[PDB]
Amino acid sequence: IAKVIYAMMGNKFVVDVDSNGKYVWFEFVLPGQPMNQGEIWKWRKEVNPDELHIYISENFSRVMDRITEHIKYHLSQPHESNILNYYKKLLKAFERSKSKIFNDSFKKGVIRQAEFLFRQRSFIQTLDTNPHLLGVGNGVLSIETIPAKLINHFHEHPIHQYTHICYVPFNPENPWTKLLLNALQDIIPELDARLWIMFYLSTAIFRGLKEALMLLWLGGGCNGKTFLMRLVAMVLGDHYASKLNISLLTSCRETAEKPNSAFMRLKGRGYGYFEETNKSEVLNTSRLKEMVNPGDVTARELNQKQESFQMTATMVAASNYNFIIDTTDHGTWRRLRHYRSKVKFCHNPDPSNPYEKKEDPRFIHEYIMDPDCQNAFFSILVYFWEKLQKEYNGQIKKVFCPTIESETEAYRKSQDTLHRFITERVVESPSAETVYNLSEVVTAYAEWYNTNINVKRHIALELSQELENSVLEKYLQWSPNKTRILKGCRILHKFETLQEPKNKWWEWSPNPS
Amino acid sequence: IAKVIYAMMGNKFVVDVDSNGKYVWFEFVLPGQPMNQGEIWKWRKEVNPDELHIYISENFSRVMDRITEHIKYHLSQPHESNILNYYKKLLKAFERSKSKIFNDSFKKGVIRQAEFLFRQRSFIQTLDTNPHLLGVGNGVLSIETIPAKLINHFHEHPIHQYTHICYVPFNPENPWTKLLLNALQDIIPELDARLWIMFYLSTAIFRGLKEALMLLWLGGGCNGKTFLMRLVAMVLGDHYASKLNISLLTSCRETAEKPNSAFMRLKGRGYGYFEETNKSEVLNTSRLKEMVNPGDVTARELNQKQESFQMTATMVAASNYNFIIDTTDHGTWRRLRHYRSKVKFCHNPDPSNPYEKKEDPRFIHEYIMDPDCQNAFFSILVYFWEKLQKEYNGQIKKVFCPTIESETEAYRKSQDTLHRFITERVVESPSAETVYNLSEVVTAYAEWYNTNINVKRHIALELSQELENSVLEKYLQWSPNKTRILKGCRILHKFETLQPGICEPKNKWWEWSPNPS
Numbered sequence A: 001i002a003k004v005i006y007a008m009m010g011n012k013f014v015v016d017v018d019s020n021g022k023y024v025w026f027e028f029v030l031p032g033q034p035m036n037q038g039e040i041w042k043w044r045k046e047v048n049p050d051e052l053h054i055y056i057s058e059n060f061s062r063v064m065d066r067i068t069e070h071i072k073y074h075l076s077q078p079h080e081s082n083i084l085n086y087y088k089k090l091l092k093a094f095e096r097s098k099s100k101i102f103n104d105s106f107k108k109g110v111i112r113q114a115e116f117l118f119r120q121r122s123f124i125q126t127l128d129t130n131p132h133l134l135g136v137g138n139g140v141l142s143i144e145t146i147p148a149k150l151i152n153h154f155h156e157h158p159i160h161q162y163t164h165i166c167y168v169p170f171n172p173e174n175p176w177t178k179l180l181l182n183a184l185q186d187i188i189p190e191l192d193a194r195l196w197i198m199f200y201l202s203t204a205i206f207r208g209l210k211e212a213l214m215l216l217w218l219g220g221g222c223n224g225k226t227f228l229m230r231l232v233a234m235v236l237g238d239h240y241a242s243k244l245n246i247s248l249l250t251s252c253r254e255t256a257e258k259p260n261s262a263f264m265r266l267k268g269r270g271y272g273y274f275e276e277t278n279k280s281e282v283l284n285t286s287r288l289k290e291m292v293n294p295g296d297v298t299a300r301e302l303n304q305k306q307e308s309f310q311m312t313a314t315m316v317a318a319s320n321y322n323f324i325i326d327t328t329d330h331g332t333w334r335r336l337r338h339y340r341s342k343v344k345f346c347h348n349p350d351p352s353n354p355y356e357k358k359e360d361p362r363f364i365h366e367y368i369m370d371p372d373c374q375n376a377f378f379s380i381l382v383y384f385w386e387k388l389q390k391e392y393n394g395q396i397k398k399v400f401c402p403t404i405e406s407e408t409e410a411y412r413k414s415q416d417t418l419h420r421f422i423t424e425r426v427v428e429s430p431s432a433e434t435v436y437n438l439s440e441v442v443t444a445y446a447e448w449y450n451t452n453i454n455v456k457r458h459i460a461l462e463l464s465q466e467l468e469n470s471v472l473e474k475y476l477q478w479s480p481n482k483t484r485i486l487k488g489c490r491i492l493h494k495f496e497t498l499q500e501p502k503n504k505w506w507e508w509s510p511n512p513s
Numbered sequence B: 001i002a003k004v005i006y007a008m009m010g011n012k013f014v015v016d017v018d019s020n021g022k023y024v025w026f027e028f029v030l031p032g033q034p035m036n037q038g039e040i041w042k043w044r045k046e047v048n049p050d051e052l053h054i055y056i057s058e059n060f061s062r063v064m065d066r067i068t069e070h071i072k073y074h075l076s077q078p079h080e081s082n083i084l085n086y087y088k089k090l091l092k093a094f095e096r097s098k099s100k101i102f103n104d105s106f107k108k109g110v111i112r113q114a115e116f117l118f119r120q121r122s123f124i125q126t127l128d129t130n131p132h133l134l135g136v137g138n139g140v141l142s143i144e145t146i147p148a149k150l151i152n153h154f155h156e157h158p159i160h161q162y163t164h165i166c167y168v169p170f171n172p173e174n175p176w177t178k179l180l181l182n183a184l185q186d187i188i189p190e191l192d193a194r195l196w197i198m199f200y201l202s203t204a205i206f207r208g209l210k211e212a213l214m215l216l217w218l219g220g221g222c223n224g225k226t227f228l229m230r231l232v233a234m235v236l237g238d239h240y241a242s243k244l245n246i247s248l249l250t251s252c253r254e255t256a257e258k259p260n261s262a263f264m265r266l267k268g269r270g271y272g273y274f275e276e277t278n279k280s281e282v283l284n285t286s287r288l289k290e291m292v293n294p295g296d297v298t299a300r301e302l303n304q305k306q307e308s309f310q311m312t313a314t315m316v317a318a319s320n321y322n323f324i325i326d327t328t329d330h331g332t333w334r335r336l337r338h339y340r341s342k343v344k345f346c347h348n349p350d351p352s353n354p355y356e357k358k359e360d361p362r363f364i365h366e367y368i369m370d371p372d373c374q375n376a377f378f379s380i381l382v383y384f385w386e387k388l389q390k391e392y393n394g395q396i397k398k399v400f401c402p403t404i405e406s407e408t409e410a411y412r413k414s415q416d417t418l419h420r421f422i423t424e425r426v427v428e429s430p431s432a433e434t435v436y437n438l439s440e441v442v443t444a445y446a447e448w449y450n451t452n453i454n455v456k457r458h459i460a461l462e463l464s465q466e467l468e469n470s471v472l473e474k475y476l477q478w479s480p481n482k483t484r485i486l487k488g489c490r491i492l493h494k495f496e497t498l499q500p501g502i503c504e505p506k507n508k509w510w511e512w513s514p515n516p517s
């Protein structure tokens, strides 16, 4: 019975072994069937194949009816002494066995063996591996080709995960599309910066290898960052975007040794965002470079040791308090991007200040539950991804925007405690020679910033090595006892003295830009 | 047998799988059956369909007897040799199989087979999703339209949660309603403040998305706020309201990632209250912003996986001690409300103290249990919510209340350490200039409250531009070495010196007064 069932309807169900050694039933849903909303044309996980139960109860019974008709017809024709015994015994046995298909234990056995019959090797691990296919509420999108293609018919692609919002082609004439475009234009004024941000954010759809970079932008309390971050995260779906606590950064004590559970995220996700925190946060390579690189890392997995880490999600972090980065490595800062928001919303907008506008509480309280907004936002996102692919072939680095990386290098010029101390307390005051050794200058600097900003423990070797990588070594010889004593300066203290296109902005900006 | 049972009672049962991958049976309660108090006209969770197990053996016997009568009657009629064998064998087989419907194993198999026939996709996750339908002790309550409608017949709304408080239309003539209204009037004297707080408490009935607002209002040592806190909690019930500790509000080194079961509260709750604490406590966005905004939040089920659930519960926090807030963010101080109680009940109230009265101990606790009472209070909340919907279209921000947003802004003008420093030390004393990168100013500021007020971990980066968010930068330029040295002030120590350098309701207040109110 299991073999007949597999032969006659085996194109709709597959099974495979999970990580726990348990057989799992998967059913390919079809139109015209009871189902959850927006999961059509894709596989779903079935704890128990109810459809298979009903099918073997009904269609198989129909087949048995056909067999009974056939054997009755063969008995009808006259024959020799075989009819009185052989066909009568066969008919009696088949009539006795017909009712067996209505027994519960018999169905359990036939399904237990259909588990072996339907077993397809390499199905769990191959699910959702293709990054060019995105589960959508109307089927699945095909973005490997230009333009984007939506298929809502039969296919062989093994897609199981999905988002519950339908997809429509990008029409700029829709009311919601115009509203969203106007809001995006209002939030950030610069054309090049806005295009760069939209281009970078459009990559959340894709789940393959991406350029390793980290995006940080700050500013007014009402920058509207949360309004967007939340919209992108919710529209992209929970299965593809997740909320990451700031505790992942600023590693200390436990780091990645004591049981950690937050690391299991980003497994298949395509978007990761950091929200506003209480105040300024300090961090420097504290399990940060392992998130920046798209390579393979390892750490604690909930309650396990490790399986594998292949992260592919885009990373965005915005706040209203400046982040503290104390490093001089060129490689650490290469993979970083900084921006500053110059718009601060105000409920009393005076005409004298163009960099401010009137808030709309319902703009963040509502307009998020509306499905039309989410459809418009997929339209915008896929349009921007198509534009990026057409122009820069996926290279987010090769895009040109003057203000960006310029604000980044300006930020890199600041947030460097060494240069502040150097051209605050020693530079412009060289007409003296009182320097015991490197140790005294190291201490002066250490308790300097300790009060200048914050306190912390430090290693003297690092502070001695950085001295050569500065501008204070221009006069730094060594005695016969070496020690590399500075050959003249005055460690100052107290105060003392020295003694815009009009329209179609969203479509394209020229190649020079 | 399973198919016949489904065709015979397919309108009273549904089967769906939970998050644990096991089938769950639901039964639609009907009048005239053994049941708990107030679970009428709604589905109830059944671990095992016991009454189905007895129905399949009681009522199916009638159908089986009808079949036996039919086959016997057909046997009575004369025919050819078919009656000799076919009917006799059919009757023998049927009488053999009749006793099977009584068998325990057979019944279990029939139930396990009917599990699939009674299965209904998308039922568990759609339970209680509608926020305009509320379970009540005598059916369900609908607040989709004004006036509210009570349903006491069949319906197709998937409602499972309920409260054991019967509902009656709001009638001021009931003695308990009069007593409760008088008590509310006495507790809070101001008309507009009373209307505002009643309107805010009315939103506890709703379970959908709500405006991000927190009620943090100070009260007298003997105001009686807890009495109401317990009254509303008892009226709503356990399924819709719960008690929360103030420890979560003042976040420690632990966060949402740390395992906790208290944070799993508010899942479907429509109310949450914070009681009186021991002393004034410190808090500043310590999981306050994420508890205020109605955005989706994660769900860390202790040591289990991280789920995601929506927060839709109203929150109230009233105490006799102040709350230490150290921030200047406009956004943070825009989703909060503050009010100070002006009544301190006394057991020997002299006439010379109009803003207080006598205490009726049997009150804060008395009557609370009285069923009747409960029922009443409800009516009050339903009427007030209907009034709010009629007037302000569900916007608690759009309401006009002069006594509120003035005490709140006065409180905002307090709890700000920087202005104390500004108009205590540097203002009115500009006739000197001794500033070291403002670093000495930062140290003086820090030590100031460290001794004057309280202590904590200190950082200086946030304070570099914090001075610019004041009036101290009226003279602050930079030297050739930059360093942005303040260009005039006087650090003050010890004594030093000043060196040169509404309407009262007529008879009824629940009528809300006209639109100006």
Ligand SMILES: Nc1ncnc2c1ncn2[C@@H]1O[C@H](COP(=O)(O)OP(=O)(O)O)[C@@H](O)[C@H]1O
Pocket: A182, A183, A184, A186, A187, A220, A221, A222, A223, A224, A225, A226, A227, A228, A276, A345, A358, A359, A360, A361, A362, A363, A364, A365, B331
């Ligand atoms: N395009 C817009 N027009 C009018 N108001 C807006 C617009 N975008 C955002 N707002 C309002 O201004 C506020 C922006 O701040 P928010 O979105 O919370 O991010 P953040 O507070 O982190 O800057 C929101 O409350 C939102 O209601």
Ligand SMILES: Nc1ncnc2c1ncn2[C@@H]1O[C@H](COP(=O)(O)OP(=O)(O)O)[C@@H](O)[C@H]1O
Pocket: B182, B183, B184, B186, B187, B220, B221, B222, B223, B224, B225, B226, B227, B228, B345, B358, B359, B360, B361, B362, B363, B364, B365
């Ligand atoms: N309207 C009222 N009618 C009768 N008694 C009241 C009323 N309001 C307050 N009381 C009494 O005064 C006390 C309220 O003071 P308080 O110490 O704040 O109580 P709690 O803090 O327990 O709510 C209650 O014990 C209550 O018995």
Ligand SMILES: [Mg+2]
Pocket: A223, A224, A225, A226, A227
């Ligand atoms: Mg925001």
Ligand SMILES: [Mg+2]
Pocket: B224, B225, B226, B227
């Ligand atoms: Mg109390």
